[PDB]
Amino acid sequence: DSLMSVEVRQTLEREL
Amino acid sequence: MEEVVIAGMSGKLPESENLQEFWDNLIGGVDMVTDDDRRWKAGLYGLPRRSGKLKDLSRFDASFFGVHPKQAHTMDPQLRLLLEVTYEAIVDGGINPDSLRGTHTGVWVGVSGSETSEALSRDPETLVGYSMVGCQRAMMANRLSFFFDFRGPSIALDTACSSSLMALQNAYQAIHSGQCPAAIVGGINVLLKPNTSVQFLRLGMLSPEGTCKAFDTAGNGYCRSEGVVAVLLTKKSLARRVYATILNAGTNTDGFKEQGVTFPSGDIQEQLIRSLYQSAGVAPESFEYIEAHGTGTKVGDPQELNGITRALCATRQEPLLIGSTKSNMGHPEPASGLAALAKVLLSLEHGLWAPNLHFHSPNPEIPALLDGRLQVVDQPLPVRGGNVGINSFGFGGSNVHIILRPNTQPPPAPAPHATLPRLLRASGRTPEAVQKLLEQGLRHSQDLAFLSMLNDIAAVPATAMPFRGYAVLGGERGGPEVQQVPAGERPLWFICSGMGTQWRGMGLSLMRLDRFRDSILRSDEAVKPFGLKVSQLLLSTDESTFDDIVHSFVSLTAIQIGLIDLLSCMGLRPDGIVGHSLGEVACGYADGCLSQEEAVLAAYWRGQCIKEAHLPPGAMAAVGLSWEECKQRCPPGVVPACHNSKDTVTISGPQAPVFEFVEQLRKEGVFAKEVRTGGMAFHSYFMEAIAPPLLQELKKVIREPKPRSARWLSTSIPEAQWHSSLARTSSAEYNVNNLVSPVLFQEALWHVPEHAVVLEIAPHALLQAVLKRGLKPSCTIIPLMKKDHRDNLEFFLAGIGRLHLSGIDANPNALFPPVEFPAPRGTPLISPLIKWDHSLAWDVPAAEDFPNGS
Amino acid sequence: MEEVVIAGMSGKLPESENLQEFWDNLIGGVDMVTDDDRRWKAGLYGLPRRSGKLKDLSRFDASFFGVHPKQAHTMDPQLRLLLEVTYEAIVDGGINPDSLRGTHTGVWVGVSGSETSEALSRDPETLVGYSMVGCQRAMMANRLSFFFDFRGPSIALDTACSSSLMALQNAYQAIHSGQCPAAIVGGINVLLKPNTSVQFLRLGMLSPEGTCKAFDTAGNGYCRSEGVVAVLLTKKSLARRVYATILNAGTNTDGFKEQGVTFPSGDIQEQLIRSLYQSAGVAPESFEYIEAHGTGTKVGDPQELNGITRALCATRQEPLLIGSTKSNMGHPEPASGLAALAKVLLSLEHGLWAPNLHFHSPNPEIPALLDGRLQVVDQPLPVRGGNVGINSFGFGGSNVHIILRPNTQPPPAPAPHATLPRLLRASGRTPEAVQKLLEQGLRHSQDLAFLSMLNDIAAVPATAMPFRGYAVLGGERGGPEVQQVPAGERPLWFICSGMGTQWRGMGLSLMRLDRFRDSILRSDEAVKPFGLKVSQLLLSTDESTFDDIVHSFVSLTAIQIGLIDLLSCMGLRPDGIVGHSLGEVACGYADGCLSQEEAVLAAYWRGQCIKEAHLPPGAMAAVGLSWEECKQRCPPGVVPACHNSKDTVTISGPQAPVFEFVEQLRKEGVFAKEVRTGGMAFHSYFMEAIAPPLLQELKKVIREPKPRSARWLSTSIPEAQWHSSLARTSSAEYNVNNLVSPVLFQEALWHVPEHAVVLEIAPHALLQAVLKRGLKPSCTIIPLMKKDHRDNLEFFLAGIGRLHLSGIDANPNALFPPVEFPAPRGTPLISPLIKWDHSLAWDVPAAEDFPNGS
């Protein structure tokens, strides 16, 4: 979501 | 179909108690945002340490606005501040608030929060009912309408950040349609509980540094601020003062956006700007400044500035100046529009655009800032000319835009009446308020419009403001006089003296007044055919003129008639009239039972009949004896003449009875004042034959007489004959009886009430000492002219000034030519000059009265 | 300068989920106020036990309005309810909300409290940012403008008890000035925390019994209530439905009162009422009902009713009816105006005035109640005629008054087209919503305006409402059909068959439609000069007419042209066209490259040239063999004719080759279908000589031809010749090649996409079985006519109905004559027929989330 894009990139780096 | 103007302004902004302090901080470049624990701690809950807050929050003049002290403690502080600044705005307009007491003027207030309401209702066991009346959001407008007695619409509206300008837009539409004659627009914001700031922090809208870096690369949010602003709007014909004219005003909403509800859309804002100027009929080239919203956010500033450069900077060929007051002040959310409007109007009044703070490098996403089509005001630069646009956008999506045209009225051309001294009256709750108004009037003594509005706002009852004052400006003496006025009504009494008060140069100093000169020339054209003109008796006076008694008679009656005319245009209506011989002749014009021509011809015919026939030279020795002792100590054929007081009685007779009481004047304490007027025995038995020739001439002037009123107290008629047929009308037989009867100036004086204000209408107040011992000690005696005074106009104006200090309302603007209706710009502000009784402290909610998660 | 009407209505009131439930409870005389612990305890803090509260508060269709489920929990419940009733109001107006998506319509909401905002911000450690977006008071209007995409003003205003009617007054002024085309007025009140009720109790405004004894001797206060109401306002030209016309609307304020801020003043209210009707130009005799404020207080009721009887009952000579809905419902503070307006409009729609409750004896301080000049409605009495006044007064002193004139449109005169069957389509979030709409349409099958607005509101995309349905009303079969529509776009394809599908009575049943009859008469006047008229081929048909092939040709092409015209006025534009011989002739009119007259004359000239020359009788036996096996098993001189499918191929030749395959039809599984049309071998080598006489006649009709489009797929031209010069335009050589070439109806069918919707344009769908096995199984085939059907108009309307169930929008209102613009009164309500997906429960604040003094 808009404000949930920070958590989104967090999960992305956790997968990376 | 009506033009709408901004007439008044007042405000309370951070580190800005008055509107002038605001302007100074704005142009001073001071960071009005501070890092102090004035409302909560420094950085609790991770909040930013910096915020803009008001100087004081607990001061309120509760007795003036008629609120009970127990109700004042449980009131919203922002409503108390709004009541005070709402009074200050009306007074800044030059309008007395009592002239709007029954009218259809409306109130529109932009609020967004009520934290005092939820702090005062936390304990349901110790509640009071008054917290509903003083803290409900509708009461922020309804209490204003209740106190000021306004009959128009009374609305409180919330439209997020654009709430204050939306109220201005609705007030504009009410005046424009002809629904309302005037309006009041308000905006209020106060930071009390930190939970709202935590909400704004979690939304991502607050800068961590607490700074509005407007149009800057480093902008990351805004800083929360406080503020209480009010303006007065009116139609053009009611305006004494004009700051600007509202050309157009409108609003729209963003609608649906794919990005979210919060995100700004510059396309709808551009449409609003273009539709406004089109409908207004103004070209986009005519703009020179636009106050942007300018909150300093990362995505809002490029959207707003690109919308501005698409709507405005297409074919312009000139840089457009842009600024934002939130960089100086911070961002009050529902009061941001009126604060920006206050900055714009102060900049227009002082001729200089106030600079922005915290602007170092342009935002790279705004290409109009990099090629010069938009120019940020970062230095003080002068105002050149053109229109100013003000927009404020709420975060819900509400967009509002104003176009206003500044007034460019030049100062007036010099005139010969501008060198004459003027009067300035003042009123206030405290002596310091009156002192402030009088010293600011002294500082600007040559500004005629400023003094006219200051005289207009001073007509307040003594129960509301108990301290009044006055100062004569443009004279050589000067000196403010401040005293406390007793409450209640005091009757006004007119006393005009008789003969023996003439001198060389009667009323010349106040021949410069236009209405006095008009009255003198009216009396002149009246006596013109009778081989006489009193203008050379005024200007060309020497000692060969006033020793004649005809010239003395007309030059007394004309001066008294001119003084009565000046007092009548002043607004003053007497409650009791009592005269003394020729004074009682002028009492006919004072009462309205006579006119100009009959009074002047009656005085001249009295002089002409007296100078026609000849009788043995008479005397007016004055003795220190009472009325009863004088009848038993005079020789037969010698009659007492004037009953001035219990100790002063004037005797009348020939030279040898006059020489008789010279020896008795040596005996004991007896006055030997033997002042005569031409050696003629007025009020005596020697003129029993003077009346039948005189009566014949009079019947041809005061034919068909009018009845005397109950206010006129006769002095030639005894008390028991007051109901007779001779003393009901002011006929020709009434005037000839005045010459042949003694003047009873004592029994008339005991009918004067306790607290009367006595005005002496004479070219020289020689009866002032008689009236002091003859009247009750609770009376005030005011002279109007003084013999051999260098500037008798200053003496007259001081008498009007101390008439204001007694309690009688009297506006000295009517004496002089009126000022043109729009005041020129650069006229000094009035709303910083109003001071209140702030000796008490009232309750303000603390941060501990709000839930902290315990 | 524009007339303003009330177009839509919806609401949620105590014990009144829908507007009809409200009306029933109002006329039922039920006490909608209850004594239940639905929000707090029974009598805690000494509060009254009785209050009016909504039935449910935790239901919201979050997916429709596009809010995230985590954002929906932290939303104000009153905003969720306002979103739903705001949709229901627009739908009640008969207006699709998608027609207002870019317009300048405004939103005005009257709120007074935000308790959810302070309940959701009590813990500053577990806060979320979404509570600012869902609970701020400006968002109650801004979220409505965001979802519905409204560009007008979006204002939330608080004016105490008169807040809802003040919003209506401002929306009136926006439409009247021409600023806005439409508007939405809302009013919301929800009782969540008991501290506000304790404040009202300590002020002395709440009745201890919890009853509004309006106009009664025993009145001692009011009862607090809840409510969510919305209405839709519009200009007169946009209105499909009119409840009433707003004649005038205005407001004022009491100003200063000696008694206090709270006390009511009837003199200012009387002035407001008199100024309104004067400015409106209506006489006071023309009123028949006034909805008073009627709160039941001790000092408010005599002031209001004496003001009413001074402004209105001076010279009247008739009793004036008076009522108050607060006696039935209780008093919602900022939503009292729209609730009273809802009661008034429901009473006008049903013809009966709803009675008051709790009225036993008149107040002795109101003398107009004791002599009959004012009459309280305590029994249901019928509506006679005249105007209705609605006033609501806030306790701060704001006064608002409305004058509205009810519409008295009678039901229309009967017409012969009212006996024809109609179509009704519906959409909804659930199958139950579609069932509700279809059964309510079945209940009111004779109401034409009701069905027209129901058909208008049904054009919603399948992503928003995934369940659609239809029902044919006025027929004899009936039966609702409800199914779930797959999301996405589906292409629409037109297939029109060839010859062999005629029968006795072609299209008679749908000759009653006006546009079909107009197309038939246009084709008639086209063939009129050519010694022919197809009207007797329609009406006067027997078995001596259609055995001719000329009459069959024109009676096929005219019926197909009329069907295409009906589909074109329906709003439908085809994506792909593919025909079959004479069907491919009608494909020219389907594509737009032909017109009416050229198509009809081309068909008649084909028939005329065929009937002119004579060739050996031919055959059209059909065999169960593929296209390749038929070429190797025919005798020479015998050609395959029609490639319908992979298993059905029509052979062409004389009688003796036709007799040849009779014996092979016995062998294995071979079809022996030998259906012929006049014994002529179309699509064969016997008409190579038919074309040169025919071509000559054609060049005189389809001179200067137009090019064919890419949507038209040719069936007489092979695939590799599609780019040639013969197959780009629809010339005369294109039509004569159709007769002399075999029809390739298989390779055209493999170009049809996966999810196409196939429409068959034929007087009898004999190609339906061919298209089922010839196309992909993800395609829908819809016939339009059926041979020997008693009512073929019902069969056509069922095809349009299942075209709605596929996903293609098609409004059947265009088929019939339009309904007159104002709907007659007594038309059934639409807003109670809307049902949502309410399977989930959302968070509502409890009484424990508020400070109790602990």
Author numbering:
A (entry chain C): 2155 to 2170
B (entry chain A), C (entry chain B): 1 to 854
Give the exact sentences the study uses for this entry.
In mammals, fatty acid synthase (FASN) contains multiple enzymatic domains to catalyse all chemical reactions needed for de novo fatty acid synthesis. An ACP carries substrates from one enzyme to another, sequentially following the chemical reactions. Here, using a strategy of tagging and purifying endogenous FASN in HEK293T cells for single-particle cryo-electron microscopy studies, we characterized the structural dynamics of endogenous human FASN.
This analysis produced 11 meaningful classes, which we grouped into 5 functional groups—ACP engaged with KS; ACP engaged with MAT; ACP between KS and MAT; and two different groups with ACP not seen. In the group of ACP engaged with KS (ACP–KS), an ACP density is captured in two positions attached to KS, revealing different levels of engagement. In one position (the grey density), a clear helical density is resolved in ACP interacting with H68 and K70 on the KS domain next to the catalytic cavity. Visualizing Ppant density engaging with the KS catalytic site suggests that this is indeed a relevant snapshot of FASN in the condensing cycle. Mass spectrometry analysis confirms that purified FASN is full length with major post-translation modifications including Ppant modification on S2156, ensuring that FASN contains holo-ACP. Taking two substates, ACP–KS/dynamic MAT and ACP–MAT/dynamic MAT, as examples, the hot area of the ACP–KS/dynamic MAT substate extends from −20° to +60°, whereas that of the ACP–MAT/dynamic MAT substate is confined within −20° to +20°.
